Amino acid sequence: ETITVPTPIKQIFSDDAFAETIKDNLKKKSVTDAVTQNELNSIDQIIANNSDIKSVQGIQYLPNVTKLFLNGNKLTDIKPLANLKNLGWLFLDENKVKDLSSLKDLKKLKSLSLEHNGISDINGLVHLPQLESLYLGNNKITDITVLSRLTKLDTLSLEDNQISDIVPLAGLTKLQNLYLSKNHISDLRALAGLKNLDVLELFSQECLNKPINHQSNLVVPNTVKNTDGSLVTPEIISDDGDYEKPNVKWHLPEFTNEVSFIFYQPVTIGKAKARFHGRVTQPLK
Secondary structure, three states, X not given: OOOOOOEEHHHHOOOHHHHHHHHHHOOOOOOOXXXXXXXXXXXXXXXXXXXXXXXXXXXXXXXXXXXXXXXXXXXXXXXXXXXXXXXXXXXXXXXXOOOOOOOOOOOOOOEEEOOOOOXXXXXXXXXXXXXXXXXXXXXXXXXXHHHHHOOOOOEEEOOOOOOOOOHHHOOOOOOOEEEOOOXXXXXXXXXXXXXXXXXXXXXXXXXXXXXXXXXOEEEEEXXXXXXXXXXXXXXXXXXXXXXXXXXXXXXXXXXXXXXXXXEEEEEEEOOEEEEEEEEXXXXXX
């Protein structure tokens, strides 16, 4: 893809903010200055975080860009990135990107960061099996099915999301750094085969059960399971409850909003030592 003649920067890059970025990058003196495709070929790096950018329309004509640092902007549509075949590092933290469908020819992309975009659907990752690093913290991700296809990742961050099923990760045995803290994980069984782990984080899990009826002798089953499949005994129980394996029981003579319990168990997988820690809360009606 190539511009048909020397064209003013203003007319290639429709976003005022991104046009200025290119102008400064090319060391031109005005957004009306015409640029040749040769000058657009010479750009290999765009560092433009917190620059008020709403659109990267025009970037299609930058074949050779290898790095894109675009954190803290306002990008919603990444379609113009589709055909940047030489891009290796892409940072889009704190943007509004909610769709990765259009990343289906970034076959040299090794590092992707999409933290804090409010993303839930990550299925477009199926097009990037060569990824070595993927940062997805602070998003609204429930379904990590597609990550099973990302078998070359060594670093994967999924912290502070809405995940409870981590079975999709069982075949990612090249993983060395896995961040899973602040999710809804109560079952560690499927992480048992990740024997190359050096760093694992598993703290502050929160599990909010579906409501049950209040009653004097309240019984709630424990379903917190270790990697070996055995139940994790609660550490602390609210409202003077106690543990009658496999259930947690309370005497509640008066009505209460909610009951809960904390679990905390040290864990080892391969060379990585972690703390499987969290809270299960049971609303009453």
